[PDB]
C-alpha cells in the first residue's frame, strides 16, 4: 500500500500492457532495486521480476522490468488469457515503514468473452433429511463476467426466505462460480409439487427444477 | 583586507563553526551511494569535535549495523550525541554485516555530523549527515541579522 500500484489493470490477447509502481523517495527514488510478484487466484505469489529487469529461469521473455526516477513498471509483450493474475511490486524502504515494502496490488484483467454458467441443481439428501434438515444445492459456475441473479421458487411461486448465496469468485480458467443453498424443512420440501432455482445471465436465464422422487 | 591584523575577535562566543554537508556539495547522497564512502576499521579511534552552527541537511541517516551475532559495529552514542537538528529527509536502515570488523569510518576524511558534534565514526542509532565545518569570526550583530 506504501508503493502505488494501478488497482486494475486489462488487455486484449497479442498486446502489449504494463503496470506501474510509484513510491517515495525511499522505498524506489533512494535507488532501491523492485521486484515483482505473480499471484494466481487462491495461490501463493510467484517471483516474476527481480532486480529491476531480470527474469528467473522459468519466466517468458514475454516478461520484462524496468525502472526510472521513483517509477518502476512490468511489461508484458503477446499477452496470453494465462497471465490474468494478481500482481505486486516489492522494494527496499528507508522510511519509518519497515525495510520491506509492497504495493497495493494490480488485477490484471486479460480479455474473455461472455460465458453463461453451468447450473446444477441438487435436491436435499436422503441422508440430510434424515437429520430433520433440508437444503437445495443450485451452484452455477464457469461463467463471464462475475455477476448473477439468484430465484427461487416453490411450484411457480417464488419466495426469497432462507437464502445464502455467495459472491462469484473466478476459477483457475478465469471464469467466475457461484453456489447458492435454499435452507427449508422436509416438509416444505415436501410439501410443493417442485421447486425451481433459475439464474439470471446475459439476459438468458437457466430454468433447472427438482421434485421430492424417493428412489 | 589582506592584514594578519584584518579582523577583530571580542568575545570567544563570536568565533562561529559551521557544518556543511557533502549533499551541499553536489555529492550523491542515495543510502546506497552514500554508504559506498562508509568502511569498517580496528585500530582507530573515534574522535568528536564541537562545531556551533551547521547547514539544514538535505539528506540523513539513522543507522544501526552489528555483525551476524547480533552486536553492535556501530558504537554507542556519547551523551551529548543528539540527533541532527534539521533534516528533509532520513534514511532509517538497520542490518548486519557477515564479514566486518572494527568501527565505521568515513572514507573521504569527512564528518559524521550530529547535532552541534562532528565525528570520525558513525553512531548507532543516530541521526547524522555527512559534511565538514568551517571557522569564522562573526559578531552577534552579525549574527543576530542573519539568524533573527
Ligand atoms: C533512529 O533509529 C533508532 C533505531 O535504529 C530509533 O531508536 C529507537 O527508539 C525507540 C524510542 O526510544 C525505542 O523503542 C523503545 O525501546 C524500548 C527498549 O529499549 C522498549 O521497551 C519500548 O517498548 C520501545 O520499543 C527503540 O528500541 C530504539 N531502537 C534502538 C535500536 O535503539 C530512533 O528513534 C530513530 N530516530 C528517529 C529520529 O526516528
Ligand atoms: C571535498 O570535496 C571534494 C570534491 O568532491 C572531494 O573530492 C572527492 O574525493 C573522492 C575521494 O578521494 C573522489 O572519489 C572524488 O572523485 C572526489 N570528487 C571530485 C569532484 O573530484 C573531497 O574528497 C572532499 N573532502 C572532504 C574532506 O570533504
Given at each position: 500500500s506504501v508503493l502505488t500500484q494501478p488497482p486494475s489493470v486489462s488487455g ?5 500492457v504494463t503496470i506501474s509502481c510509484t513510491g517515495s523517495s525511499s522505498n524506489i527514488g533512494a535507488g532501491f532495486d523492485v521486484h515483482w510478484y505473480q499471484q ?5 505469489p510467484?517471483?516474476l521480476i527481480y532486480?529491476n529487469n ?11 522490468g524496468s525502472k526510472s526516477g521513483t517509477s518502476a513498471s512490468l511489461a508484458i ?8 493474475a494478481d500482481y505486486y511490486c516489492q522494494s527496499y524502504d528507508t522510511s519509518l515503514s519497515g525495510p520491506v515494502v509492497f504495493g497495493g496490488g494490480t488485477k490484471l484483467t ?106 | ?29 542515495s ?58 529527509t532520513?534514511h532509517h ?56
Amino acid at each position: 500500500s506504501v508503493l502505488t500500484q494501478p488497482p486494475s489493470v486489462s488487455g486484449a490477447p497479442g498486446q502489449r500492457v504494463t503496470i506501474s509502481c510509484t513510491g517515495s523517495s525511499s522505498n524506489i527514488g533512494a535507488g532501491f532495486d523492485v521486484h515483482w510478484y505473480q499471484q494466481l487466484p487462491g495461490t501463493a505469489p510467484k517471483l516474476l521480476i527481480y532486480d529491476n529487469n531480470n527474469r528467473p529461469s522459468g519466466v517468458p521473455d514475454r516478461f520484462s522490468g524496468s525502472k526510472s526516477g521513483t517509477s518502476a513498471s512490468l511489461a508484458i509483450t503477446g499477452l496470453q488469457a494465462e497471465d490474468e493474475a494478481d500482481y505486486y511490486c516489492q522494494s527496499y524502504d528507508t522510511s519509518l515503514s519497515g525495510p520491506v515494502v509492497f504495493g497495493g496490488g494490480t488485477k490484471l484483467t486479460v480479455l474473455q468473452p461472455k460465458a453463461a454458467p453451468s447450473v446444477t441443481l441438487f435436491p436435499p439428501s436422503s441422508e440430510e433429511l434424515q437429520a430433520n434438515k433440508a437444503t437445495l444445492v443450485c451452484l452455477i459456475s464457469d461463467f463471464y463476467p462475475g455477476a448473477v441473479t439468484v430465484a427461487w421458487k416453490a411450484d411457480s411461486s417464488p419466495i426469497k426466505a432462507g437464502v445464502e448465496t455467495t459472491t462469484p469468485s473466478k476459477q483457475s480458467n478465469n471464469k467466475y462460480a457461484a453456489s447458492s443453498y435454499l435452507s427449508l424443512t422436509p416438509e416444505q420440501w415436501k410439501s410443493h409439487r417442485s421447486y425451481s432455482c433459475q439464474v439470471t445471465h446475459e439476459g438468458s436465464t437457466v430454468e433447472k427444477t427438482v421434485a421430492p422422487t424417493e428412489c | 583586507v589582506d592584514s594578519v591584523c584584518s579582523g577583530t575577535l571580542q568575545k570567544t562566543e563570536d568565533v562561529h563553526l559551521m557544518g556543511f554537508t557533502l549533499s551541499g556539495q553536489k555529492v550523491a547522497d542515495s543510502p546506497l551511494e552514500a554508504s559506498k564512502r562508509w568502511a569498517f576499521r580496528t585500530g582507530v579511534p573515534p574522535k568528536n569535535v564541537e562545531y556551533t552552527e551547521g547547514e539544514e541537511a538535505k539528506t540523513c541517516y539513522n543507522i544501526s549495523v552489528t555483525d551476524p551475532s547480533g552486536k553492535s559495529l556501530l558504537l554507542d552514542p556519547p551523551s551529548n550525541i543528539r540527533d541532527y537538528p534539521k533534516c528533509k529527509t532520513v534514511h532509517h536502515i538497520q542490518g548486519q554485516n557477515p564479514h566486518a570488523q572494527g568501527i565505521a569510518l568515513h572514507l573521504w576524511g569527512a564528518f559524521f555530523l550530529y547535532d552541534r558534534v562532528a565525528s570520525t565514526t558513525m553512531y548507532r542509532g543516530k541521526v547524522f549527515t555527512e559534511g565538514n565545518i568551517a571557522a569564522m569570526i562573526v559578531n552577534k550583530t552579525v549574527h543576530r541579522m542573519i539568524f533573527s
